Design a binder for this molecule. Structure first.
Ligand SMILES: [Fe+2]
Ligand SMILES: [Fe+2]
Ligand SMILES: [Fe+3]
Ligand SMILES: [Fe+3]
Ligand SMILES: [Fe+3]
Ligand SMILES: [Fe+3]
Lengths: 202, 200
């Protein structure tokens, strides 16, 4: 993902449309924030399981990608949770059980599909609802998450394509959004503009 | 996709597992070849329609990617048709889509590619192996490998939908491999030299 003159927003970007045949139940923005947190909690458990399996299967680099992405989802949860907490102090983040991890290639596909669903269906749906309800804070949070998900999708497909050709590149995760970059060739986050030296390496 | 020391095959690669919850009806290799052709014919019509829409939507480069991928599916059809014609002389290829916003079309493309690379082709490859049809295994393998590359190209285009560049997309002459830009030497799927590619 290239760095543009300004950070991507639903106002200056053109990949924010929701698939017409959406598989996402949309409620109030508060409900959607909670729904997103639930989905991300599941994603985190999935990627964590996928990472462990990857290591056992001998895919050290892919395991690191799964771990970096799991961490990215935790950032999304943090962003979403912060908004929910302001509106409902008693709200507690949910916990889920760990799902099964299968062959690494299939796990990468599972990851890619989930990411695609989130970036082109769920988040766009939640963003639209937030826009229609005038909840700019939610639009911001959902937009940030949405943008990282499509990057995750690409990273998973790239790993899948080179499943038998890994390298020693580290994955760098942005400190405040889910953007992940493979290798050192980047300057700042294309999603939020945080400098490269603020990233965490996986 | 990186160029390995060896040409990727179902024998030396580890991304040929098929999804457990398959959406692919599997029959004889002959039927599967025809099914693949029908699917690719749909894909070609889809991408051609997406390219047209992309140009109307003002995304010239993405239009070119759609055109390149459509051409890739045509290559797949050619490989599969050749085998079918041999297994059934006289066979006639079938004829067949709605287009939406460019970003959605890229996602639709990506999803179709993922289905083909992780579901359809792997299933057909295994059935071909079971029946001992080596030609089909080779053809299905070649197609399968290109589809995952297409998926990545579509997601890459989606991520930089508002940040196009002047890169041309290069299509391999005998397989569906597509490379964006000039930084490549040969096809990682079949090893064909860069000078034999066609630019889009
Ligand atoms: Fe994600
Ligand atoms: Fe394809
Ligand atoms: Fe997510
Ligand atoms: Fe960031
Ligand atoms: Fe295809
Ligand atoms: Fe090739």
């Amino acid at each position: 993902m290239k760095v543009r003159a300004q950070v991507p927003t639903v106002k200056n970007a053109t990949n924010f449309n929701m698939v017409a045949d959406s598989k996402t139940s949309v409620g109030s923005t508060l409900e959607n924030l909670k729904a997103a947190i639930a989905g991300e909690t599941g994603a985190h458990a999935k990627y964590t399981a996928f990472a462990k399996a990857a290591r056992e299967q001998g895919y050290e680099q892919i395991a690191r990608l799964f771990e970096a992405t799991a961490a990215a989802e935790l950032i999304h949860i943090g962003l979403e949770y912060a908004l929910v907490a302001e509106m409902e102090p008693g709200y507690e983040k949910p916990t889920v059980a760990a799902p099964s991890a299968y062959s690494c290639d299939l796990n990468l596909i599972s990851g890619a599909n989930g990411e695609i669903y989130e970036t082109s269906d769920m988040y766009p749906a939640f963003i639209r609802k937030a826009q229609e309800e005038g909840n700019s804070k939610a639009v911001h949070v959902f937009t940030r998450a949405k943008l990282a998900e499509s990057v995750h999708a690409e990273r998973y497909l790239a790993a899948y394509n080179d499943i038998d050709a890994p390298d020693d590149d580290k994955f760098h995760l942005c400190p405040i959004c889910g953007y992940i970059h493979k290798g050192e060739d980047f300057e700042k986050c294309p999603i939020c503009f945080r400098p490269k030296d603020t990233f965490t390496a996986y």
